């Protein structure tokens, strides 16, 4: 009974792994978030062979399928029932994702509405 999208194109991604930071492995103070290395003798920013890679703009995603979940839908944070009617004329291309804070008493009467409106919810069995 899945709510299919309008059209489900083929999603191709030029890279799947994250871009880890230089030397985020020898240390714990260096988090995985990326920081362009700017040191003089650095081997990563000279683009040596076999080293870590760098987030160029070449890795950009196809604009036709950018931000698009593997269900062929884009997404939208929904904080309450009223923010669904905003989404009822984008039904077959966007989905709803009830926020993390909406308690289960409201989230039940949100999944309830989105069912009538045929809007797809990504976390419809969330809290219960």
């Amino acid at each position: 009974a899945a709510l299919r999208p309008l059209v489900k194109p083929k999603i191709v991604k030029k890279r799947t792994k994250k871009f880890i930071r230089h030397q985020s492995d020898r240390y714990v103070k260096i988090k995985r978030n990326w920081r362009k290395p700017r040191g003089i003798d650095n081997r990563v920013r000279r683009r040596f062979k076999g080293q870590i890679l760098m987030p160029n703009i070449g890795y950009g995603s196809n604009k036709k399928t950018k931000h698009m979940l593997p269900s062929g839908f884009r997404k939208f944070l929904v904080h309450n029932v009223k923010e669904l009617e905003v989404l009822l004329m984008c039904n077959k291309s966007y989905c709803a994702e009830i926020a993390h804070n909406v308690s289960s008493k409201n989230r039940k009467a949100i999944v309830e509405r989105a069912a009538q409106l045929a809007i797809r919810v990504t976390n419809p069995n969330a809290r219960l």
């Binding site: 931000h67 884009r74 939208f76 944070l77 905003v86 989404l87 966007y94």
Partner: peptide, 10 residues
């Protein structure tokens, strides 16, 4: 309303 690279109106 502007979030998730979309911009709707109420």
């Amino acid at each position: 309303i502007k979030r998730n690279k979309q911009t709707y109106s109420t």
